[PDB]
Design a protein around this ligand. Sequence first.
Ligand SMILES: CC(=O)N[C@@H]1[C@@H](O)[C@H](O)[C@@H](CO)O[C@@H]1O
Ligand SMILES: CC(=O)N[C@@H]1[C@@H](O)[C@H](O)[C@@H](CO)O[C@@H]1O
Lengths: 344, 342
Amino acid sequence: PQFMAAIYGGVEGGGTRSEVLLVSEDGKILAEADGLSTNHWLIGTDKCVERINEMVNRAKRKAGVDPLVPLRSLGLSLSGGDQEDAGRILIEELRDRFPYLSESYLITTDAAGSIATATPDGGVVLISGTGSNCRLINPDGSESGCGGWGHMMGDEGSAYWIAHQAVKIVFDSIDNLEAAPHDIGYVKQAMFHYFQVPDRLGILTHLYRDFDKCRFAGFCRKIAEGAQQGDPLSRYIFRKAGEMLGRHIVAVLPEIDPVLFQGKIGLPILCVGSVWKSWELLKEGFLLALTQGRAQNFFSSFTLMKLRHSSALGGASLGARHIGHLLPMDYSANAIAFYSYTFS
Amino acid sequence: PQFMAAIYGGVEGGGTRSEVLLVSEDGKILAEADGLSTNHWLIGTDKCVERINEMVNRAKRKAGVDPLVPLRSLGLSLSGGDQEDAGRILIEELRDRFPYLSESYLITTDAAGSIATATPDGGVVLISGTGSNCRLINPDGSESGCGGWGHMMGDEGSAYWIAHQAVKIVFDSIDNLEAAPHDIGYVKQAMFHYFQVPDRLGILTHLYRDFDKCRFAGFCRKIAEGAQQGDPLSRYIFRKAGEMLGRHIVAVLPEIDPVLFQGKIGLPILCVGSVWKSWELLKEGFLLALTQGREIFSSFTLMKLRHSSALGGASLGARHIGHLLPMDYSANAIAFYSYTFS
Ligand SMILES: CC(=O)N[C@@H]1[C@@H](O)[C@H](O)[C@@H](CO)O[C@@H]1O
Ligand SMILES: CC(=O)N[C@@H]1[C@@H](O)[C@H](O)[C@@H](CO)O[C@@H]1O
């Protein structure tokens, strides 16, 4: 069942990296492939177009799709996929340049694809990878958000933000502009080690002409490691990151349909992105923000969920709906709880 | 004496723009010209060299320098002019691409050129234009600084920082991430007006693919206007900018040679850049930060330049080849504010 039936593609295009899934008409994953970054705010639409085609074609060959056979549809769940202009252009260019790629296209957000992987009934996603974003889709389809503004205007509680906070705390400390809350020794040495430079002036080229958000944000690993090994400053930065992520939830709480709080699980919060691997370092800060953030109202508990498949699966489902097809989904298999908290 | 004596050039690398002065051996300004920004961190060394040549040549023509006659020396007081590699590369490229431009080159910082316009004896400069920077050169040649790290890692108290604080407070307020300290009404509407967009999503292209530090930092003008008109949020942001500028001076105090505190005017602080036009909005914040910091230096006097920082650049450029460029330092700067602590 490869050549007789429609094939539905999804691309998850948030953060360090993209992933394609190809799925059969009946919901069976036929192929997966990794791809490069597809954030148009950072790389422009032209490179996005090239990268999407290249990675989808690798997946097509894995699946054994015959040459020059288009996908039925392709759901692109991309960072910045809500921008009207960028979306129009991405699709025009894909069609013009690569006419055998797919018969139809849907452009949507990374966050939409994530929610759609886990539920058809509305939910909350909280992304923390190289960037951060909090998005709600209510059962009625009304939407709300906090954050998602990128490194130039937010990304609080992301790997970029953790990395930036560490470097900034070190710079200000050494400048005598502001005293660090804890000793900077471990973080300063880790900075010189990670960037392979001997001083602050050497760091600058990695902020300016040689800047790459993935390369800079990767410093967050050294902060996670320091925290794991008990460095006060590193623990503090992760606690503050946890707090910022919690504040994103607190921000959107007033717009959440009360039905979403009901049930044994309480409010489910879908947690997407690499920073959640360090949950234990975020936990104290996260709970401080939630307990401190929630007003006589709403919720007795919440449960943090993670995806068991790529958000590209949700993107495939959305892409199929876009042309009238219900892609079969096993929502129970697609996500699982990793933490639950009851306030009392 | 145009053809018979050596001509010394200086280039002030600003924020929004650059300026070149050509100066005779005897210290007389022969020409000046504006040019484009020459910050290598933002535009790269190739455009920097193209821009230096183009602007210096317009100056040469104004002065009546014959075609293909080099300057004797050219001092480039640029943002980031302390980076070894960039300095070396800039000079290599200029010599290679434009061999008639100048016989000799000095690459130094914007701050050093400013200081050298006002005094040969050591001083402190506090820059606030599109970016911010505090630098000290002591009498003995020892140096210290606070800030100057650009928009990705500081620039507190600059036009970029004021603009960015205003936009960030609006974004956070609307998101319910953080309550604004004062009502965002004026600043939100001014943001939509300045950027010509209807919503926050529309602002994003101006932060990313279409980002320009000078275009973004120009939003500061709307915040100055609002503050002039009495808007509490706008006033608050300028107060915090003042505090940040004060905190740069506080940061470097422990390194200042006590000799520089002595005398009728106390510590002279050279103030360079557009944001100082708004001194009256910065003042209470600046004073609070200085007063607090000194508790945890009897008086100070804020000075402004009366000639381009390119003049100091030319001076340093001439020194680089063994010539003492005559300078009227009393003519080159003037006091605009004085303060004696309790
Ligand atoms: C302006 C921009 O790039 N925003 C992205 C956002 O779209 C994405 O959802 C988030 C998570 O990867 O990272 C950034 O905040
Ligand atoms: C990394 C960078 O661009 N730093 C500049 C600094 O060189 C300059 O003196 C200041 C004033 O224009 O603006 C920024 O801080």
